[PDB]
Amino acid sequence: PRPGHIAMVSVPSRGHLHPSLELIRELVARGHRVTYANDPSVAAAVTETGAELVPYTSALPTDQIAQMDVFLDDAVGMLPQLRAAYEEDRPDVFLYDVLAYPARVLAMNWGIPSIQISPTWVMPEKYRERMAPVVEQLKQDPRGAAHYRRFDAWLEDSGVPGIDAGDLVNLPERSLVLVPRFLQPDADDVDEKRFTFIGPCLGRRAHQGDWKRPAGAEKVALVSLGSHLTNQLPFYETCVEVFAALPDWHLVLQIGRHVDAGELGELPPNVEVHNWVPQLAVLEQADVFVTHGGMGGIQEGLFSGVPMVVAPQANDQPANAESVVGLGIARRIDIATVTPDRLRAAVVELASDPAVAERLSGLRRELRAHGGTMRAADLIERQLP
Amino acid sequence: XXVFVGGXX
């Protein structure tokens, strides 16, 4: 179509930036004017995409109700900032991350179409009924009941009283789900008139350096619990304990920015430790990948055809662990209760199983078939005048 | 929401 103004809105939280960079870059490359509203803390990632950075102050940075109150604070703060920025420069369409749903409220006010960009699997209108007891019990707590009242008041004050607080956020008008259908739990209940499974939006190798397998190491393992809170030194010691006594294997242990404390005496010759690694480069030579099970790591494992040992912890991860195990390409463990032989058995068995390798090749072909960046950009352009 | 609550944050 004609140029047109596309407005992307997201949040500075780490899982909500990388999934769509290549999509925004593609929309810019197609000659559109793309503005990207986000917190200035992630100005580097936003500007590298080529879109026009529209700064706003995010309220996102130890209780479940308190965590919901922080999100509602961010929604209350985001909407007036978005309104002020775009009042005289209204876009043809609003693209918004799952946590940037105030952009949809703004789009409803101005009669502008909106498209949700979901970085992980969505919750279909059947997943929510299973959670209805949890929601009702929350409403019995005065803190919970106060929260839902403030949420409803914000909708009414913002000019969208006709929509439920759940439907806004989790029942978007249109949604691009940046995961393959085989990583979406209960894909049966997802209405694909509304949600489109795009898969990852890729756009050529990110570089960041090349990693070559050390000569004399027959198999390579990467341990990277890349969910920010990688504060497990006891598990890291189990990993070195396993791969030390596992010659012919080379362990690349990514411990995270928060540590590098108390390693060994220089470590066994098997282990090389980093605070951060070029993950895609290491996975290129990896025979197994140990991750928390975040959507980013799992899709990177699938893309590289590397079997995974999954240690789910955060809210997203348990279902992700179930999916990859259900696909027959992964083993699930608990960091608290995992044993050196138990961890070693999963590593050696997964890497040597030829049926596991064959399933990975199939998932690689299935993965790209969802359309990716080009299909997502084409769908967005259908919304332009 | 912690575990994904679906009916909110």
What was the experiment behind these coordinates? X-ray
What is the C-alpha separation between A242 and A340, in angstroms, rounded?
6
A73's tokens: 């604070």
Q: A34 φ, ψ to 5°?
A: -115, 125
* Contact by Cβ (8 Å): A190, A124: yes
What is the C-alpha separation between A36 and A48, in angstroms, rounded?
11
What is the C-alpha separation between A171 and A160, in angstroms, rounded?
14
**Where would I find the beta strands (DSSP E) of A255-322?**
271-274, 288-291, 308-310
B6: DSSP letter: S
* DSSP states of A197-226: E------S---S----PPTT-SEEEEEE--
A243's tokens: 């791969």
Smallest CA–CA distance from A126 into chain B, residue: B6
In chain A, where the domains are located: 1-205+370-385, 206-369
Pairing of strands A175-177, A114-118: parallel
**A24 and B CB contact within 8 Å:** no
* Contact by Cβ (8 Å): A22, A206: no
CA quadruple A352, A355, A360, A365: dihedral positive or negative? positive
What is the C-alpha separation between A336 and A295, in angstroms, rounded?
22
A163's tokens: 């929509």
Tell me the nearest-neighbour CA distance from B5 into chain A, angstroms. 6
Q: C-alpha angle A45/A88/A31, rounded to 5°? A: 50
Tell me the nearest-neighbour CA distance from A165 into chain B, angstroms. 7
First to last CA, chain A: 8
A170:B6 CB<8 A: yes
Q: C-alpha angle A201/A293/A194, rounded to 5°? A: 45
3-state secondary structure of A73: helix
CA quadruple A101, A103, A106, A110: dihedral positive or negative? negative
Pairing of strands A52-55, A33-38: parallel
User: Among A383, A377, A382, which residue's Cα sits nearest to residue A30?
Assistant: A377
**Which residues in chain B have Cβ-Cβ distances shorter than 8 Å to A147?**
8
A68:B7 CB<8 A: no
Between positions 289 and 318 of A, the ones with CB within 8 A of B are: 315-316, 318
Instruction: Please report, for chain B, how many H helices and E strands are present, in that order.
Output: 0, 0
Q: A130 φ, ψ to 5°?
A: -65, -30
Return the CATH fold of A206-369. Answer: Rossmann fold (3.40.50)
Tracing tokens 């070029």 back to the chain, one arrives at A278
Select from A137, A170, A179 the residue whose CB has the most chain B CBs within 10 Å, as the one to mutate to test that interface. Answer: A170
Counting every residue written for chain A, the total comes to: 385
**Which residues in chain B have Cβ-Cβ distances shorter than 8 Å to A128?**
6-7
What is the C-alpha separation between A279 and A292, in angstroms, rounded?
14
Between positions 142 and 181 of A, the ones with CB within 8 A of B are: 147-148, 151, 165-166, 169-170
* Contact by Cβ (8 Å): A330, A308: yes
* Contact by Cβ (8 Å): A61, B1: no
* Contact by Cβ (8 Å): A333, A346: yes
**Where would I find the beta strands (DSSP E) of chain A?**
5-9, 33-38, 52-55, 93-97, 114-118, 175-177, 195-197, 219-224, 249-254, 271-274, 288-291, 308-310, 330-332
Q: C-alpha angle A289/A290/A296, rounded to 5°? A: 80
Smallest CA–CA distance from A71 into chain B, residue: B9
**Which residues in chain B have Cβ-Cβ distances shorter than 8 Å to A71?**
9
> Hey, what CATH class is A1-205+370-385 in?
alpha beta
CA quadruple A118, A124, A127, A131: dihedral positive or negative? positive
B5:A131 CB<8 A: yes
A/B interface, count of CB pairs below 8 Å = 49
**What count of other Cβ atoms lies within 10 Å of the Cβ of residue A17?**
19
Q: Do A1-205+370-385 and A206-369 show the same overall fold? A: yes
Tell me the nearest-neighbour CA distance from B9 into chain A, angstroms. 5
* Contact by Cβ (8 Å): A38, A16: no
Q: Which residues contact A185 (CB under 8 A, 6 or more apart)?
A: A121, A127, A319, A322, A323
**Which residues in chain B have Cβ-Cβ distances shorter than 8 Å to A137?**
none
**Resolution attained, angstroms:** 2.2
